[PDB]
Amino acid sequence: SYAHLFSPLGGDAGDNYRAITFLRSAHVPLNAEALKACGAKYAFVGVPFDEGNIGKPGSEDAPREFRLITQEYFSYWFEYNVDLHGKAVDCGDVSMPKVSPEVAHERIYRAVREVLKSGLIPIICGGDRSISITAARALSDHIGPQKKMGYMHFGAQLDMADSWAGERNLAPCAMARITELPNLDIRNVAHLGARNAMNPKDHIDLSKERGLQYDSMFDLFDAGIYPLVERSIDRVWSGTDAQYLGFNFNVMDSSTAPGVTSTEPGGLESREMMRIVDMIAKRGGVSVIDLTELCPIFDISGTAARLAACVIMRLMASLAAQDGDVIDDKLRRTDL
Amino acid sequence: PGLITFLRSAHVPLNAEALKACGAKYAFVGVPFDEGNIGKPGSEDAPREFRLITQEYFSYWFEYNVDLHGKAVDCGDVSMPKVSPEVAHERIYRAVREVLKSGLIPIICGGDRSISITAARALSDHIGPQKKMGYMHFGAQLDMADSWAGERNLAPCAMARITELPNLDIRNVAHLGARNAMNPKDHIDLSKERGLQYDSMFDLFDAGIYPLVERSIDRVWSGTDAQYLGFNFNVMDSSTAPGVTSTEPGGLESREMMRIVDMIAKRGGVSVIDLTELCPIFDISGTAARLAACVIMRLMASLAAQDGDVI
Amino acid sequence: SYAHLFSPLGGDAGDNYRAITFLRSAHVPLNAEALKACGAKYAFVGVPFDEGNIGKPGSEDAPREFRLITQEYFSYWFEYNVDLHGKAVDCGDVSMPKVSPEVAHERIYRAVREVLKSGLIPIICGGDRSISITAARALSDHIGPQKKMGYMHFGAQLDMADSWAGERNLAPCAMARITELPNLDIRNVAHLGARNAMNPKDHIDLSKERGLQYDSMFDLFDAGIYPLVERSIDRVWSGTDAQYLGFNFNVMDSSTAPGVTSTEPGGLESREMMRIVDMIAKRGGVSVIDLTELCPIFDISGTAARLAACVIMRLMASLAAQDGDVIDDKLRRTDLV
Amino acid sequence: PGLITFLRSAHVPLNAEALKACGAKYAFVGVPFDEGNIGKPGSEDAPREFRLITQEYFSYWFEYNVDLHGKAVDCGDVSMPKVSPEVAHERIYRAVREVLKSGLIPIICGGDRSISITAARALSDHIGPQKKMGYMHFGAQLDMADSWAGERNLAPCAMARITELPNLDIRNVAHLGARNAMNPKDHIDLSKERGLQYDSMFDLFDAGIYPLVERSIDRVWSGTDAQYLGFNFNVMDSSTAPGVTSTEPGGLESREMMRIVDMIAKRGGVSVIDLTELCPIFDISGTAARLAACVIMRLMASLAA
Amino acid sequence: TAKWQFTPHQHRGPAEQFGENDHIYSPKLHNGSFKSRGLATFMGAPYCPPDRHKIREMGAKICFLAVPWDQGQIVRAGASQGAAGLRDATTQYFPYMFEYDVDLLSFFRVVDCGDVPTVPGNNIKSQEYTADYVTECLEGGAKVILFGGDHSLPIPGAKALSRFTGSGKMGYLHVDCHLDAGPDWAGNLITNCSGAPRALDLPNCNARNMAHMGSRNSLNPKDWWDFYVDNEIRVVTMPEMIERGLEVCANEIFERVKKDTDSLYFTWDTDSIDISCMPANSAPECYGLKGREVIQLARIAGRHGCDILDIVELCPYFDPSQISVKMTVNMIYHYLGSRAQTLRQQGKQP
Amino acid sequence: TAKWQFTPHQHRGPAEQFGENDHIYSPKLHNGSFKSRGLATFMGAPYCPPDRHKIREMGAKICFLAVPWDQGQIVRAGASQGAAGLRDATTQYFPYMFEYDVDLLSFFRVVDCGDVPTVPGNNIKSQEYTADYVTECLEGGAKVILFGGDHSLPIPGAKALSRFTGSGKMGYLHVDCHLDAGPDWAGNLITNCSGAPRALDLPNCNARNMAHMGSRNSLNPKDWWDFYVDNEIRVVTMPEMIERGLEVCANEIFERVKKDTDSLYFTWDTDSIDISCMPANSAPECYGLKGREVIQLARIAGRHGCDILDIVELCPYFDPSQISVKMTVNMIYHYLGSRAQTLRQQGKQP
Ligand SMILES: [Mn+2]
Ligand SMILES: [Mn+2]
Ligand SMILES: [Mn+2]
Ligand SMILES: [Mn+2]
């Protein structure tokens, strides 16, 4: 069936595209056999967990809001001649009712391992940044000690606290734990967007001690943004067997993503990020995609959530185009 | 995990066989349709916000020793095209008929008050011309326009259409709460001409509320084979129902409606429940949506207690 | 001076009552010596802690909003002929930057014991309901094994979870911990306002098993509200040496208190609560006053916070009137200068 | 601990001796006065909201390797009566003189743009008739009403009063960002009659912004003994300054104002900083207040570097 | 000569309606302004400039005049936005009240006189403007509905009514959470906390025809209470209204403020209303009138009648709902519907 | 005979201003409507009913006509509230633009024609009304600014301009995040996603004079793209605008849609604007025009000129700020200021 490509027909075919799963995809249980059998390339996994956050509360509601906002779009991308229909499934949310944070993280880890076992690309929607520690560890364990991982994250905060209030796996520690993964060489790590007054000196110091070559927002401005992004893309993708890509949309200028846990004006514009998406998609693959720290209670007109969905879906569409996975442009609505 | 449903209930397709097999007594049906609305926009978002608000409540009603778990399922939203009202209404009609066919009670959440026209017609057709229907609606507006802007099935026409149903005797029709100036003279004239014995808010206050409510409950339930119960929460005082399409000062307070719900539940059954005109863009911290949820859930619990369906 | 009783004079005297401390009170450090010397009867203690909350977030910012809202009023109560000026001081907030929940509670405990040692009445503004566990433990320890405590709480939730996610001191556990205090007889415990669909069955079961004589919202309506409130006041105050009084303003109908962590319409009206405040003040004293679960991000026009401030300040004014602590009503603004 | 202060800074009484001894370079002064406002209400709440937003930021600025801890103190709000504008302005005047006496830089947060009239006069009086003042303001409105509704000290008169100060040569005055129709013809006429060389937004875009900003910086700082710098954040594009009294589309973006801050800081000093017309009731998730806070704090960090 | 004329359901052009009573019936050719306000006046009434000659030529017997001034305020600005919310909110109603069987628009020949202009920062001059605009309405033969704006409104409002009343006697009723009887505020005699003492100072307004209803809480400095004690002016606190009932108290006070009077000024602060019904206010207050009691008080006021009704301190920016603006519509409409029903029962003309 | 007359700074009564140029200067006796809107029309212009004879008698050369209809919408209602927000926001500006040295009100003799009435539930009849109201404006001798309302507006709008253009040729420019070229939507040919095919269907609107600018993202079913391919209508996507430059692209496109034409219909969806500057929209979209680019495009449009400008889908209830409504004021005002500057430069008359 191709009816989903086009304006709905009348009669019993009339319906309302916005009246819930990610991009209206089929629901598939978090089971590797089922995921392998459904034909999709991506599995959306909601992680409504915020116990790692030390800042403004609210990310727990982001997966539901993100799902809802994807109903506002069609699966077809005229800019790319690609159709995302059937390319993703929605695995629901990791179940974490009335459990300890250690148990919550165990469930996240098992969920991520299970999707990776299926061969599908997990799209992990938090939830707080701490989820990335667990999901990246799952990727690291999935590929094993003889393979190499690359990691790239966009965000205003480095999250390079060695410890926070006696704890070692809260959100502000996330990169400090991720860069300890044994098959993630620091030369294959990129972090883009760090801002003034969002990064304690100890975070800078630990980054320097470890050789983390983060690209601050000023670094990006000094370089004209794209040439430096391209160099960091090359470091993450060249020579690595798997790549983890994460987003905290506080990388964006505040007016372009108000509904996030923490923000400071002076970040990326949406037109800059959409160019970066194509540059990433040129490399022809990704192993895990995450998004964390959306904060719907602070959003207005769903701005940040719409931006997030448009970036994630554009990335999927641009990857399909780079793969030559395009639809027959001769298809017409009068065929139906 | 990850689906948002009424009271965290199971999703069941809008299919009579599935609904009869699932074991619930109520089927929640979302109707995000607002093209009958003549006032401020926003009720299309009500089914989602209502569902969300119900997620915050436990299903156990300790005062009734009742657990609402398993008593309802959620059929999702009626699928309807935009800018095609006649087709949208046909879709609503078919959905309500299918739930009624299962024997479950539809809980219909609009959307604008026009949907009641169709849902009431579905109940009327379901029971057939040899049976009698009763109808009770709470709201601040009579909605007795024979026509409005030359049109005949908009929200302000709803009662003018519903009271034309051939097996709904006007003596079995109640309308409670009318007040304030969104009630033009022809709505009163048509009510008098047809004998609609509405209980205005002033009349209710003058009577101490409950004795007059009881009299109108008796007219709707006594001698009828099926009863349709509908709410526009602007029947409530604005203070406790701000987020409605047309809020109205000087109405029922939350504890009063809760007492009325128990009076209705004494009758031991209802055939259709609707709620329309919730309007989340105007709400104050979800107060109107919470009031609606508490009224619906309390009616379910009180009906369960009346039936002896306790823990 | 008496100038604070009256509209401001002109010249150098002209100022703006609205332009932050509780009731524009002096700040006094959390130090028993200073508190005993400052002459006040109450010490306001903000507790911006929400790590015990499993529900909607927001209570951490309540103390600041509560202080802000009190700037909206004078210290004089014409209904009572009482002046609250100098009767309270503001001790600031308990400091809890980047610490474990256990350290936070330790700091809360230390703060409350320190105020109690000075002889002042703490007015503790949370923050989540869990802080009540610690504050009640402090009162229990302060009075000692030879004295008896009474406890009265208004709220829609019983908070009688024996444990929650394996934890024992989160907000939904608060009454389960408070009723284990060794000098708090269950017969001197009142809980008013419990609501359907906010109270799981095990919380009811545990209440029944322990003999917690809670007054549900239905019980209150069935009684005409006040006679039952009076019976519960009598149990809390008769025979006890110290009384703890706490509020979760979700006891109020949602229209009167929208900015709270969890609410369901069908609670008390403000005019009922103002009557209740005078009934409590008839007993002539209270040892601790707390308020928790205010949620400013959900408040509209500051409604819940204003209600809370009016209830608390009315209670202080009504207690003063009951003690005969009234001003000279012959004073006039023309006396000034 | 419970007292909300600009940048979590110490509170210091508005007293020259105390301010000189506390070790800070800046003194935050809240001015919740809005009785000169001719537009939508709301700026009276800005000093409180501004303080609150600054609580969210760390004091360390890694690109500058500067920590702002101890650089500022908070003097609280100026005490002013309502419905007595003349007395309120006298109170502002005395507060600004007292801070200037201490040698610290006042950071004055309104409140409405009328406050600038008085604060600028205080600076003018503080340096006295043998010294020269320079004045730079960013905003979408010229505020060049000789009178407005017959009154002479309302917000739209502010530049008409400030450019009458006797030791403020018009060649040492800059006004950047003017655009859109909240600029009636007499404001242009008076600017032309007086020689006010304002840099309109269209002028700025035509020049690539920064070269023109640099010329105006040079006019304000070169040869002057003291410099007053003021912001109405409606100079910014509406997208990044929604919560202001009179928001204006088509203005500076956040990264552009941040660059300009660095250009100003290159001159190594400023005598008074003001920010007026923040309007929290119109803000979107605090965006305008955050922009304002980031501009002020980046200015402090860049000056320290 | 000015003509009193309006379009039923507002819109002109090709789909204009012309029926002389079409405004009391469901709209026929279109939706009127129930969804989109268009260029609505208060009640859809004809606009008439505040000019005694134009008002008298139109035969108008009620003038709606907004006084949005909010810079005579000791609390916080915002009431300048009240009148726009009110006018918008009348599009949600018909001018016909079935509870009274009255067409308010044609019964009173209502006109919307627009807004009184303001001089920002200048409370003295802005109040001089208000008194002069109110005088045009009274001299035009109409009773007046004045919509604030802050509570400084009764100072020019009562002064204009007092001048118009001349050698007769004028009563003054003040309904408010706040006693509003500062002798001065920071030296200023004419802020929004001095309505009552400034009314007493008028040559024909006497303490025996003044009263205050609705007070509670601590935004009430001692001199505001002492004013009532020393002048022996009746004060009905909100707790007294609750204990005795609005009907008893309201009827008693109206009898008192109208006894042997030729005119009555009635000023009504929205803060009298419980904050649960009225969040959009400069200084909103719990422990007030519930919504049904507001409508009852408006009905009681309508039975007795006043010459000027003012309603003050509405701040719509503070309310994300429509409850506050629609409450103020009903204060006015129930007052007018009750007044018309009373006149008609008495065989009297407006 | 109708007279074109207005009061500078709006207020009549004792403090009315009368200077013939007072509306372009700081107000003199009072604050006008900068704080409190009063009874403001668009730009404070005279109201003129949409009637060709009245419009011509006033000499009006621009009619502002709101079309709040938002029930021809396939996304979500809300744009029925746009025109009220827009009119209110014009009180925050003078009608004088110093950037062009033009008094927009006097230059064009602007009038506010009120709103087109609607028939709820009946998209066919509501569009019939809109076309008839627009025809009165065109036949009265004015060019038109049409303010929605949903994006079904260009269907009756272009139909009325096409009718007026007769045997001549009409161009059609559509600026939007969304391609809006559904042949039908659920069988319906005239919803807000079909402006472009309904225009191409007009007998005197030809593909060579049609264009679409601003598109991006995936609310864009394939048939909407296929329409431009199958009819050889030029599409300039937002990424092309960014890459090549707004000025280069917009000038090429205005040259295209005006070439050998007698009139031009220009429809402009607020969603073309980046969501950071325009949250108040039925279908807001990232990756759009930034604020300075909106003004630049309005200026470019004004230099070339259109006969009808419509602006659609503004939903002010979704925005707690004034940014969206004030953006739509500036779209109109910069269009008119640039248009007047160009006419004056060419020695031509509106
Ligand atoms: Mn007052
Ligand atoms: Mn008051
Ligand atoms: Mn469109
Ligand atoms: Mn669009």
Calculate Rg over the CA atoms of chain A: 19
Tokens 């994250």 correspond to A153
- Across the interface, of F77, F119, F318, the residue whose CB is closest to B44 is F77
Distance of CA A314 to the CA centre of its chain: 12
Question: Would you call A102 an interface residue with chain C, using a CB distance cutoff of 8 Å?
Answer: no
Angle CA C101–C105–C106, to nearest 5: 115
Taking alpha carbons only, the member of E149, E163, E123 closest to residue E64 is E149
CB-based contact F104:F110 (threshold 8 Å): yes
Task: Quote the CA–CA distance of B237 and B251 in Å, as a whole number.
Answer: 4
How does strand D60-61 pair with strand D26-30? unpaired
The experimental method behind these coordinates is X-ray
Q: Where do the domains of chain F lie, and which CATH numbers do they carry?
A: 22-345 (3.40.800.10)
Is residue B311 included in any domain, yes or no?
Answer: no
Question: Dihedrals φ, ψ of E301, to 5°?
Answer: -60, -40
Reading across the β-sheet that carries F110-115, which strands appear in turn?
Answer: F110-115, F62-67, F143-148, F308-312, F263-269, F170-175, F205-213, F234-236
Contacts of B190 (CB under 8 A, 6+ apart): B144, B145, B146, B160, B196
Burial label for A216, CB within 10 Å (0-12, 13-18, 19+), is buried
Taking alpha carbons only, the member of A304, A247, A22 closest to residue F286 is A304
- Give the alpha-carbon dihedral of A308, A126, A257, D111, to 10 degrees: 170
Gaps after residue numbers in chain D (C–N over 2.5 angstroms): none
DSSP string, A12-79: GG---TT---GGGPEE--S-HHHHHHH--SEEEEE----TT--SSS-GGGHHHHHHHHHTTS-SEETT
Task: Quote the CA–CA distance of F194 and F214 in Å, as a whole number.
Answer: 16
Is residue A258 included in any domain, yes or no?
Answer: yes
Taking alpha carbons only, the member of C86, C142, C79, C70 closest to residue C110 is C142
Interchain contact D/A (3 or more Cβ pairs less than 8 Å): yes
The H or E element containing residue C288 is: strand C288-292
Measured N-to-C along each axis, helices F291-304 and F246-258 cross at an angle, to the nearest 10 degrees, of 30
Taking alpha carbons only, the member of F132, F115, F113 closest to residue F55 is F113
With CA atoms as reference, the chain F residue closest to A16 would be F74
Positive/negative CA dihedral, C325, C329, C333, C336: negative
Question: In this structure, what token pair is assigned to residue F66?
Answer: 């709101």
Cα of F151 to ligand 4 centre, how many Å? 7
Question: Dihedrals φ, ψ of B230, to 5°?
Answer: -130, 150
Question: In this structure, what token pair is assigned to residue B183?
Answer: 């009630």
Amino acid at F3: K
Question: Dihedrals φ, ψ of E111, to 5°?
Answer: -130, 155
DSSP string, B161-175: HHTT-TT--GGGEEE
Question: In this structure, what token pair is assigned to residue F308?
Answer: 């009808």
Say what the resolution is, in angstroms: 1.8
Measured N-to-C along each axis, helices E82-90 and E323-346 cross at an angle, to the nearest 10 degrees, of 60
Question: In this structure, what token pair is assigned to residue D12?
Answer: 């210091």
Task: Quote the CA–CA distance of A163 and D129 in Å, as a whole number.
Answer: 58
Question: In this structure, what token pair is assigned to residue D208?
Answer: 């690539």
Task: Quote the CA–CA distance of C115 and C136 in Å, as a whole number.
Answer: 13
Task: Quote the CA–CA distance of A71 and A309 in Å, as a whole number.
Answer: 10
Cα–Cα distance list, C164 to A167, C300, C312, E284, F204 (Å)? 21, 31, 31, 39, 73
Amino acid at F204: N
With CA atoms as reference, the chain C residue closest to A49 would be C54
The H or E element containing residue E335 is: helix E323-346
Question: In this structure, what token pair is assigned to residue C271?
Answer: 């005019």
Interchain contact C/F (3 or more Cβ pairs less than 8 Å): no
Question: Can the peptide bond before residue A58 be classed as cis, meaning omega within 30 degrees of 0?
Answer: no
CB-based contact C3:C336 (threshold 8 Å): yes
Residues, chain C, total? 337
Task: Quote the CA–CA distance of F270 and F264 in Å, as a whole number.
Answer: 19
With CA atoms as reference, the chain E residue closest to C310 would be E217
Question: Dihedrals φ, ψ of C237, to 5°?
Answer: -95, -25
Of the residues C105, C297, C298, the best mutation for testing chain A's interface (the one with the most A CB atoms within 10 Å of its CB) is: C297
CB contact burial D46-75 (16+ within 10 A = b; e otherwise): bbbbbbbbbebbbbbbbbbebbbeebbbbb
DSSP string, B263-306: HHHTT---SEEEEE-B-GGG-STTHHHHHHHHHHHHHHHHHHHH
Contacts of C298 (CB under 8 A, 6+ apart): B285, C56, C58, C258, C259, C260
Question: In this structure, what token pair is assigned to residue F72?
Answer: 């021809």
DSSP F59: T
CB-based contact C324:C281 (threshold 8 Å): no
Q: How many CB atoms lie within 10 A of CB D260?
A: 21
Angle CA D49–D55–D59, to nearest 5: 135
Calculate Rg over the CA atoms of chain C: 19
Positive/negative CA dihedral, F128, F130, F131, F132: positive
Tokens 């009670």 correspond to B105
Task: Quote the CA–CA distance of B232 and B141 in Å, as a whole number.
Answer: 9
Burial label for D222, CB within 10 Å (0-12, 13-18, 19+), is exposed
- Across the interface, of B1, B48, B87, the residue whose CB is closest to A92 is B1
CB-based contact C245:C289 (threshold 8 Å): yes
Contacts of F85 (CB under 8 A, 6+ apart): F280, F314, F316, F324, F325, F328
Tokens 């920064």 correspond to D210
Reading across the β-sheet that carries E234-236, which strands appear in turn?
Answer: E111-115, E62-67, E143-148, E308-312, E263-269, E170-175, E205-213, E234-236
Question: Can the peptide bond before residue C193 be classed as cis, meaning omega within 30 degrees of 0?
Answer: no
Cα of F128 to ligand 4 centre, how many Å? 22
Tell me if C98 and A57 make a contact (CB, 8 A cut-off).
Answer: no
Question: Would you call A18 an interface residue with chain F, using a CB distance cutoff of 8 Å?
Answer: yes
Cα of F254 to ligand 3 centre, how many Å? 19
Query: Where in D31-86 does DSSP place strands (E)?
Result: 60-61, 66-67, 72-77
Question: Can the peptide bond before residue E149 be classed as cis, meaning omega within 30 degrees of 0?
Answer: yes
Question: In this structure, what token pair is assigned to residue F87?
Answer: 């009119």
- Give the alpha-carbon dihedral of A106, A107, A111, A113, to 10 degrees: 20
Distance of CA A276 to the CA centre of its chain: 14
CB-based contact F175:F297 (threshold 8 Å): yes
DSSP D130: T
Question: In this structure, what token pair is assigned to residue E324?
Answer: 């506050």
Question: Dihedrals φ, ψ of B210, to 5°?
Answer: -65, -40
State whether residue C151 is helix, strand or coil: strand
Question: Dihedrals φ, ψ of F228, to 5°?
Answer: -70, -40
Task: Quote the CA–CA distance of F235 and F237 in Å, as a whole number.
Answer: 6
Contacts of E97 (CB under 8 A, 6+ apart): B181, E104, E333, E334, E337
- Give the alpha-carbon dihedral of B264, B265, B266, B268, to 10 degrees: 120
- Across the interface, of A77, A313, A333, the residue whose CB is closest to F223 is A333
CB contact burial B92-104 (16+ within 10 A = b; e otherwise): bbebbbbbbebeb
Is residue D23 included in any domain, yes or no?
Answer: yes
Task: Quote the CA–CA distance of B19 and B12 in Å, as a whole number.
Answer: 7
DSSP D79: P
Question: Dihedrals φ, ψ of C275, to 5°?
Answer: -60, -45
The H or E element containing residue B136 is: strand B133-138
CB-based contact D237:D274 (threshold 8 Å): no
Amino acid at F279: P
Calculate Rg over the CA atoms of chain E: 19
DSSP string, C191-207: EEEE-TTSS-HHHHHHH
Distance of CA A251 to the CA centre of its chain: 13
Number of folded domains that form chain A: 1
Q: Give the domain CATH number at C133.
A: 3.40.800.10
Q: How many CB atoms lie within 10 A of CB D230?
A: 25
Question: Would you call E235 an interface residue with chain F, using a CB distance cutoff of 8 Å?
Answer: no
CB-based contact D138:D216 (threshold 8 Å): no
Question: Can the peptide bond before residue C259 be classed as cis, meaning omega within 30 degrees of 0?
Answer: no
State whether residue A292 is helix, strand or coil: strand
Q: How many CB atoms lie within 10 A of CB B194?
A: 15
DSSP string, C103-119: HHHHHHHHHHHHHHHHT
Task: Quote the CA–CA distance of F239 and B90 in Å, as a whole number.
Answer: 43
Amino acid at B127: I
Is residue A16 included in any domain, yes or no?
Answer: no
Tokens 């003799």 correspond to F109
Amino acid at E167: S
The H or E element containing residue E164 is: helix E154-165
CB-based contact F291:F257 (threshold 8 Å): no
Interchain contact B/D (3 or more Cβ pairs less than 8 Å): no
Question: In this structure, what token pair is assigned to residue B11?
Answer: 């999703």
Task: Quote the CA–CA distance of E46 and E106 in Å, as a whole number.
Answer: 11
DSSP string, E264-310: EEEEEEGGGBBTTT---BSS-BSS-B-HHHHHHHHHHHHHH--SEEE
Question: In this structure, what token pair is assigned to residue A234?
Answer: 């090359």
Contacts of C209 (CB under 8 A, 6+ apart): none
Residue B268 distance to chain E (closest CA, Å):
32
- Which 89-118 residues of chain E touch chain F by CB within 8 A? 112-118
DSSP string, B65-95: TEE-TTSEEEEEEPP--TT-HHHHHHHHHHH
The H or E element containing residue E48 is: none
CB-based contact B212:B203 (threshold 8 Å): yes
The H or E element containing residue F162 is: helix F154-165
DSSP D12: -
Angle CA E304–E305–E310, to nearest 5: 130
Is residue B276 included in any domain, yes or no?
Answer: yes
Question: In this structure, what token pair is assigned to residue E100?
Answer: 């009274």
Q: How many CB atoms lie within 10 A of CB B278?
A: 31
State whether residue B33 is helix, strand or coil: coil
Task: Quote the CA–CA distance of D34 and D43 in Å, as a whole number.
Answer: 6
What is the Cβ-side half-sphere exposure of residue B128, based on CA atoms within 13 angstroms?
2
CB contact burial C53-86 (16+ within 10 A = b; e otherwise): bbbbbbbbbbbbbbbbbbbbbbbbbbbbbbbbbe
Task: Quote the CA–CA distance of F254 and F90 in Å, as a whole number.
Answer: 28
Residues B22-25: contacts with CB within 8 Å, 24+ apart? B22/B73, B23/B70, B24/B70, B24/B71, B24/B72, B24/B73, B24/B104, B25/B71, B25/B72, B25/B104, B25/B105
Question: In this structure, what token pair is assigned to residue B65?
Answer: 């020793």
Q: In which domain, by residue range, is D237 found? A: 6-304
